[model samples]
Target: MIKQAVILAGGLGSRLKDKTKTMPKGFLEIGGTAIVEQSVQKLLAHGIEKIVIGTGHCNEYYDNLAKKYPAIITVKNENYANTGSMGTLEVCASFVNESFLLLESDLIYDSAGLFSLINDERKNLILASGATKSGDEVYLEADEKNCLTGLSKNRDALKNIFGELVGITKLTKSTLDKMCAYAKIHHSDLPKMEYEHALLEAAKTIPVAIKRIEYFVWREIDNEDHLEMAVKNIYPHIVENEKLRAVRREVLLNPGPATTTDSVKYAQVSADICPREKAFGDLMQWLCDELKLFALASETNPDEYETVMFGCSGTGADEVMVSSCVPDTGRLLVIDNGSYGARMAKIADIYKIPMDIFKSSTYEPLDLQKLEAEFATKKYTHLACVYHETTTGLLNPLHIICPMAKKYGMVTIVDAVSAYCGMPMDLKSLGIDFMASTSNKNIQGMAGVGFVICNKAELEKTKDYPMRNYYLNLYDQYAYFAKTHQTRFTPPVQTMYALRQAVLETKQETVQKRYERYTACWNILVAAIKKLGLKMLVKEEHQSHFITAILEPETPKYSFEALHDFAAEHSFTIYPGKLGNIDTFRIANIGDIQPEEMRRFTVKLKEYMNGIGVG
Candidate 1:
C-alpha cells in the first residue's frame, strides 16, 4: 500500500531551545540513536522504499544523514527560520508521487503503527492513539463513522474527543495535491499555516479517516522533560510490546462470543482505524458477501443472495430479518420450537406484524403433520423459525420445513446463529429467503457484529417496505453499503477485524473440516457425560451437534452454581438453559475450541460431577 514517506523536520524547536540549539527535533538523541534517524530505519524496516525529508531548521544534519542512506532524500525548506510546518510539507509535495506516510520526524512511535498504516488500503488516513497523557497532547475528534473531523490543542475546544494525534498519517497523492493547493491560496491570511489547518481544509471534500489504536505507544519531544520521559518510559514500553511472542489462550464457552483462535485474537490487536476509511469499509462491506458464503459454499445464481450486517448480538440479526422482511399487509407464521424462536415471535408481536404461531416442544422433533397443517391453513405469506434452538441444542428440520414452506407458497426465514459455520448447508436450494447469523458463534470470532443473509430478489422486493426499526432496517443497511463501501453507522472496528481473521481461518479449515472438528468435540463431550450416566435432553440424532443440553443430575448436591464455579475454575465455561424451570445446562462444541480442550474440559467436569455425588 505505502511505498514512500515524508518526514517534516522544518520547525523552530524553540520550546526545546537547549536540546535542539536551532537544529531540527529529529536530531535529538534518546537511546544511542537520533530519534529521527530511528524513524528512518523503522520506515525502511516497514518497507518504505523512498523517504523524503523536509528539513528546514539546520538542514545540515539531515543532509549528512541522507548521504549515509540512498533511500533518504533531503529537501531544504528555504524559509526554515520563518515558515510553519506546512510550508516545509508543501515543498516536498513534488517529490511525493504516490500515497505516502506523513510523520512528524520528532516522534518515537511503535513500528506496528507504521506497518499497519502501510498495509491499510485507505486513500487517506490520519493516525490517532489512545490517551498517551504524554503532556502537550494534540487531541482529535472523529464523526460516527470514524472520519477525522476535528483536531484541537485545547481539549475543551472540541465537543467530542476520541484520541490524541500520533503525528503519523497515510495520505493519497490526490490528498497531497489538495493540501498543497489549499496552502497556496490562503498563504496571505495565515503567514505560516500549520499542516493540520490544511488537512482540515482538504477533509472538506475528501474523507480522511482516523486509524486510532487504543494502546499505541508513542511520544514527540518538545523539551528535555519530554525526551527524558520517552527514554525512561515510552521507548522501553514500545520495545517490550514489539518483542515477538505468542498470546496466552483462554477458551470461552459462552454460546455467542465463543472461543477465538490465538491469531484471530491477535488480529484485534491492530491499529484502530476509522470504520469510514476505505480500508475498513472495503474489508467489511465486502464481508457481507463472505457472510453469504458462510451460509452456503461457493455457488452463484443469476441473482445472487446478499447479506446486511448490523452492529449487535445474534438476536439483532433475527430482529433485522423479522422487522425488515415482512411487509405491512403480509402475515407471518412463526415456528416456535425453542428459545430463539420465542424471541422471533416476540419481535413480530412488537412490530405488530400480523402473524400466527405454530408451537412445538423444545427438545422434541417438529411434528411434520402439524407443521404441514399450519402451512395448509394458507393464511400466512411468510414462515420463520430458528435453525438450531440455542436453548435445547435442537436443530430444527429446515430441510423438510423449507420445502414445505415453498410448497405452500411461503417465504422462509431462519435464525442460523449457532448453526451456520458448524453445519454445511445449501441455503439457496432450501428456498430460504432470509437467514440471520452472527460472527461470534460457529464463525469462531469476537462478538458484536450480526448479519442477515437475504435472497437478493426477496431483499429487493422489500425495498418499499415500511421501516419498523431504523438501525435494523435490512434494505437500508444493504443499500447504504452498496452505495458507499461503508456501513451507515459506525461498525465494531476490532470485532470486525477479528471476524475477518476468523473468516479467513474458516475458509482455510473449510466447512466440512470445521463441522467434523465440532463433531469430534461433541463426541468427546458425549462420551464423558454418558460414561458418567448423564443424559442429554435432545435425542442424539436430532441434536445440532454444535450444542447439547445435558440434564443436571437429580440430587440436592447437584447445585448448578457449584458445578459452574468448579468448571470456571478449570478455565471451562458451561451455559445454562432457557427451557422453563428445566434443570439443564448446555455445552457447545463450536468456535475455535478443539477436541483436546474439550477432552480436558470433560476431565475437569468429571471431577466436578464426582464431587457432586453423581459419579
Candidate 2:
C-alpha cells in the first residue's frame, strides 16, 4: 500500500516571482501555513508517516522545514534550473520504498476529499478533479469507464471534459521501478523533462491502467494569481479540516471569501421553511410589487402580456418567445453583433426557423437605414435582438432599434439578460413586444430563474403556437401566474428567495440610483486599472455601467492567470476575458460590490503589480 509520498517542491517559482521573490511559492503562507507544509500535514493526518520533499530555491529553508518536521526527508534538486520536476523526482528516487504518493508542491487539497485516494487500496490511482467553472486549461485522456487513457496538452481537446489532472497520484513499486529505469536511461536528458511526459509514455509502452478518483477540492498554483487563490479559497477548508492547527495568527483568523453576501447566504439557509409555507406566496407577491410588474396591471390594460418565469438560463427565455409566438410563415430577423447575437443565430438554426442576422457591434446603434431597407424588401413577421451583449459588457442601442422594429410592424423580442434591472430600460418606452432577462446579473440574485415581460395580446397570439416543451411553454406560465400568482413548474425556492430580496433591494435603490452606483464602481475600477498602468478592453464611450474588461500585458508580471490568482487570494473574484486573441480579464461593477471595496482592490492590485515588476 502507498503510505509514503514525495512532493516536487524544488522549482524557482518563476511564474509566481511577484509574490515569491522572497520565499518559495510553496512557502508563501496560505492560511498562515506554507502550502507544502499543509500538504504534508494532510498526508500525515491520513496515516502517512514518511514524506520526501524535492527542494531547490533556498534549499536551506527547506532543510529547516525538514528539521522542524522530523518525519519529512528533504532532498536538494541541484540541477532543478537545468531540468524540470522530473529531474527533481529523480534526485529523490532513493527515498522511495513502496507504492508512494506523488504530488506537486503547488497543489492545494482537502484532507477529507483526498482521503478516499490516500486510503484506497489501488496501486495505480490519479485524483480526477471536478470542474471549477473557471474554464481553466486542463489535461485528461479517459476511456468510457472514466479511466484516463491519455493526457492532453491542448485545451480545445477537453471541450466536454469531466476530470482534470489534479497532481495527486499513487504509484506502485512496479510503476516507480519503471519510472526509475526510464530515469536512469534518460538521465542526461532528465533535467529538461516533465514527469507527465514520462507517465504518458509509460502508459503507451506498459499495460498500465489508471483509476480516477473524482473530487472538487484540488487546486494548482501554476502562476502568481493561482498561488493567491489557493490561499484565499482553499486555505479556509484547510483551517476547518480540524486535523491541522494553523502555524500563524494571520492564517488562523482569516475568514475567507463567502462567495456571496450574508443576506443571500441566510436566504439559502432558510429555504426549508419557505418552500412549504406562506413564505413562498409572500415571496411571490413581494417580488411582483418589487419589480413594479404589479404596477403594470394598473398602468396598462389587460391587453399587455402576462409575466412568466422559466427555471433555465437566460437563453431559455429567448427560445420561449421564438417557439411560442412565431408561426411557420413568420420570418424572424435577428440583429447580432456579439456572442449572444451569435447564439440567437444558433437557436434559429436548431429550430430551423427562417431567420436573417444583421451582425454588427452591439455598441453601435442598430443600422436603421439598413434595417429599413431589409424590412422594406423582406416580409419579416418577428424581430429579435439583444439589449445588452453581456459578452462585451456593452448595451446595444435598443432605444433606436426597438422603434425601428415597431415601424416595420414586427413583434419585437429583446434579450435583455444583462441589462434587465441595472440599466434604464422600459418595455413601454422601448415598444418591445417581448423582453427576456435573468434573475441573476443586475437583479443581484443567484442564477437558475429567467423571466419575460410581453404584451398580453402577444401572449394570447402565442397561446395557439405549438408547444416547444411542457416546462418551457410561456403561455402556460402566464396562465398559472394569473390564477395562483406562482410559476407553473417547481421553481428553485432558495434562488427565488434571494431573487425576491434582490428585487426589493433594486426597488429600494431605484433604477437611476442603481445606474449611478454601477457607473461609479465602473469608473473607480477603470481609474484603478489605469493607475496600475493597465488599459481596459472596451472603449469608455461604448462601455456599460455594470462590467468592464481590463487588458493586462503579455509580460511575465502582468499575465492574466497571475493577476486572477492574486485578486482571488485577496478575496476578490473577477471574470476572465472572452476575446480569443485579446489578453484581457473582466471585472463586474454589478451586484453589491461597492466603490470602497473597489478602492481596496485597487490598492492591493497595485501592490501586487508593483511587486511583480510592473511600472
Candidate 3:
C-alpha cells in the first residue's frame, strides 16, 4: 500500500494570466478546500499517512496548506521563479519514502481512475487513456501490450491511438532512484525544467510500464473557464463516485463539474448496429434514394469518365490524373514551388510524360508573363499543379493557373487534397477540367476514399485515350459510381458512414460558420503559441485555413517529446514537427473543434510550459 505522495504545485499558470495574475491557479478554491487540499484527501483515502507538497510559484499557500494538514510536508522550490517544477521535485528529493505516487497538482481525475492506479500492481506505471480527436499535441504511444513505448507531440505520427497521461503516476523505489539520477544529469536552473522531462528522457534507456483507463473522465484546470467546466461536468461525477465523493466530503473540492449532463460522452458510445433489418430490394431502393448518383445509369454518362478511387494517399491521387488523361502529343506544364509541385515532377518522370516545370515559393499569381511567352512557341496539352501544397500549407494561385490553362487550350488537373471544402473554389468558375480531393482533411471524414470532380465535356475526350480502362482508371470509377452509388469493388463502409455524417454536418452547420469557427480557433491558438515565444513557419498571409506550422526553439529546455507528454497529461494532443530542415510543428484547425476547445489547449500549453520551467 502507498503511504507517501508527491504533488507538484508550483506552476504560475501563465496561460491564464488574466485569472492567475493575482493568485496561484493551484490554490483556487474548489468546494471549500484548495485544489491542493482535495489532492491530499485523495492520497489520504489511499492510506497515505505523509504527503510532500512540492511548492514553487506561491510557496505561502503551500506553507499554509502544510501547516493546516499536520500530516502534510512542504518542500519549497526556493528558485522557482528561476528553476522549474523538476527543480522543485529535486528540492524535495530527500522526502520520498519508499513507493510514492507523483501527481501534477493542477489536474483533476475521476475517483476510480485515481484509485485504480493506486491499487494497481505495476511498480513503474503511467496512467493513460486513448483520447480521440485531441490532435497529436500530447500523446504517449504504447505497444499493443500496453508498455510505454515512446512519447510524441504529433498524433498522426503515432502508430496507435493516443493514450493520455492522466497527470497521476506511481513510481517504485528503484524507478525513483533512476528518475533522480536522470534528473541530476539533465537538471538546470532554467525556469522551464520539468520532472517529466527527466523521466521521459530517461525512458529511452529504461522502459516504463503503462496502465490504461479506457473509459473515464479527467481534466486539468489552468484558467477560469476550465475551472468552471471542472465544477460543472466533473463535480457531479465526483460526487457520484464513491471514492471521489468521500474525498470531496472530507475536503470539499468545489471547482468541480458545474453541471453534469446525463448524455453519454460523444466518443464513449459503441458503434450502433441496425435494429430493424430491411429487405434487399427495399435497402437498394433506400440507398439509391439517398445517393442520387446510384440511380444514374452507366451508359447515361456514356462510360466516358471512369471514376478512380486511389488508396495510396496524395501522391497516388496525382499519378492517376497525369497517367490516364495526358496523351502522347500533349505537353504537360507543371506550375509549382512546394513539395506537391515537386511530387508532380516525380510522377511525370515515372510515366515519361514530358513537362515544363516552373518553381516559386509564394502563393501569389503565377508569372503569367512567362507562361504566355512559353505558350507562344509551344502548345501544351495539359497543365497540372497541387491546389493546396500540404507541405507549407500554402494555396497555389488556382484562379490564375486555371484561367491561363483554359485560355491556352490546356486541360487543367488540380490536386486539391488540402484545399478542398475549406477554401472557396467552384469547379465551374475556375474552369478546372479535373480536380482531386480526399474524404479526409477538411471534410472531417476518414481516409481511404478519394474523388475527382470533372468537367463532362473534357472527360468525354479522354474515352479514346490509351490505358484509360485498366487499373488507376478514373473513367471506370466515374462510370461505376454513376451507375450504382457503390464503388467498383467493396469499399470501406465505415468511412462511407463517416462521409455521410461529415457532409450532413457540414451542410447543417454551413461552411461559412465552420470557416468562422476555424479562423477564431486559429487566432486563439496563434495567440497561445506567440505567448510561449514561438513564431509561425509560414507568414500569416500565406497560411492555410486548416493547419498552422510553427518553429520550435533550439534549446534543450524545449523538447518535442516532453511538450507532447505534458500536453497529453492535460488531454490536448499536439501535431508533430513536419517541415524539412526546420524545427517546426503544426496544429490542425479542422475536425469538431471550437474556440473554447482551442482555449483549453492554450491554457494547458501554458501550464505545461510553466511546469517545465518555461517562464
Instruction: Give per-model CA RMSD.
Output: 13.6, 22.7, 23.7
Model 1 spans with C-alpha error above 4 angstroms: 1-245
Give the TM-score of each candidate: 0.63, 0.55, 0.50
- Candidate 3 Cα misplacement greater than 4 A, ranges: 1-312, 362-379, 483-486, 608-615
Task: Tell how far residue 430 is off in model 1, in angstroms.
Answer: 1.7
Cα lDDT tens digits, model 1, 393-468, are: 8888898899889999889988988888888877877778898888788888888899888889889999999899
Q: What is the C-alpha lDDT of each candidate?
A: 0.84, 0.69, 0.64
Top model number, TM-score: 1
Q: Write the per-residue lDDT of candidate 3 for residues 219-257, one digit (tens) a residue.
A: 678666677777877666665774433311111001111
Order of quality (lDDT)? 1, 2, 3
Superposed Cα deviation of residue 471, candidate 3 (Å): 3.1
- Candidate 2 lDDT score relative to the true structure: 0.69
Alpha-carbon shift of residue 480 in model 3 (angstroms): 3.6
Show model 2 residue runs off by greater than 4 Å: 1-260, 271-282, 285-289, 292-305, 362-366, 483-486, 612-615
